[PDB]
């Protein structure tokens, strides 16, 4: 009936659920990485999800276990440590004081899900590589948002393994919100959609209204709010200390050179960022910083200032170190 000490250090390093730099690869090791599985239990059990949604215990582990096994081990980025990273930084987002009381559970159990299975059975390549090279999931996507796509699909089916629908006992108006919200959500991380996002955001921040809460009056302001925090989180790595930033680009260009690396064996042109032998690793994060990141995070920060203050500060700090970095 007593914990193990490895489990012990767990339950301790849990502790920092609710903050911005969770020692997340630590979880990892310390969870035989299953930090998927175990952030997600303390998050959903942190924030009733369990009581709310009457879902049964074994269920939830069950599913999450099932989820977690169908991210790929072998991917240095795209993995269940991401998963669970953007599921983590997601839930801090939805704790700020801006937005405290906005969204209803529904919506709350929407973007946190949307959030697990969001790079779902990632193959570690882009879409194009795989629209380039036939794939069957490009045929069966009509090479359209065909990772994105194809991640909700698995994140819905894995539902109907043994024991894992977590959502069994939800009416079918909550199973339908739910579905649109998550497919909204997941489908809006295609980086292609990213100019839409971030401009639909800044029309938000000009039009801006508070009662001294964020006031959002209909489907299209709340779930656009929800997209942009979930691409936020999937856009998170630059905010973190610089400990963990380091290592997220380590794996970002892991993943991308192997991409390369394929990609030159098969005599294709090799996608930006990906010749291990061409490449600028500190360059290229300033400008993914002063292009992609900055600006997003900007436009976050002024439709919650000044909660994300200490976040754009580091990402801020984290772009003169790139920065100072450069031959
Ligand atoms: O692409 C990203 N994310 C991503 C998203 Cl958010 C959505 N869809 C696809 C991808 Cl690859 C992504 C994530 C992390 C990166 O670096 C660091 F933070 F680790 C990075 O560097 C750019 C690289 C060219 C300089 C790129
Ligand atoms: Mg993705
Ligand atoms: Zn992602």
Request: proline share 3%; hydrophobic share 40%.
């Amino acid at each position: 009936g007593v914990k193990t000490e490895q489990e012990d250090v767990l339950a301790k390093e849990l502790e920092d659920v609710n903050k911005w730099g969770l020692h997340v690869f630590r979880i990892a090791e310390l969870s035989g990485n299953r930090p998927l599985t175990v952030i997600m239990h303390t998050i959903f059990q942190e924030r009733d999800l369990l009581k709310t949604f009457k879902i049964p215990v074994d269920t939830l582990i069950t599913y999450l276990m099932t989820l977690e096994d169908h991210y790929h081990a072998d991917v240095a980025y795209h993995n269940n440590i991401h998963a669970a990273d953007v599921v983590q930084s997601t839930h801090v987002l939805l704790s700020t004081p801006a937005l405290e009381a906005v969204f209803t559970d529904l919506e709350i159990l929407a973007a946190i899900f949307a959030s697990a299975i969001h790079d779902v059975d990632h193959p570690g390549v882009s879409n194009q590589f795989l629209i380039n090279t036939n794939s069957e999931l490009a045929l069966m996507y009509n090479d359209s948002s065909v990772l994105e796509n194809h991640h909700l699909a698995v994140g819905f089916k894995l539902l109907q393994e043994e024991n894992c629908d977590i959502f069994q006992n939800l009416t079918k108006k909550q199973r339908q919100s739910l579905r649109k919200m998550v497919i909204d959500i997941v489908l809006a991380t295609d980086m292609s959609k990213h100019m839409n996002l971030l401009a639909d955001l800044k029309t938000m921040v000009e039009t801006k209204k508070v009662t001294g809460v964020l006031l959002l009056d209909n489907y299209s302001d709340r779930i656009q709010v929800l997209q942009n925090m979930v691409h936020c989180a999937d856009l998170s790595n630059p905010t973190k200390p610089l400990q963990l930033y380091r290592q997220w680009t380590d794996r970002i260009m892991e993943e991308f050179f192997r991409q390369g690396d394929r990609e030159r064996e098969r005599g294709m042109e090799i996608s930006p960022m990906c010749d291990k032998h061409n490449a600028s690793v500190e360059k290229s994060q300033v400008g993914f910083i002063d292009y992609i990141v900055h600006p997003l995070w900007e436009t976050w920060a002024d439709l919650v200032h000044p909660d994300a203050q200490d976040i754009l500060d580091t990402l801020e700090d984290n772009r003169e170190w790139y920065q100072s970095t450069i031959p």
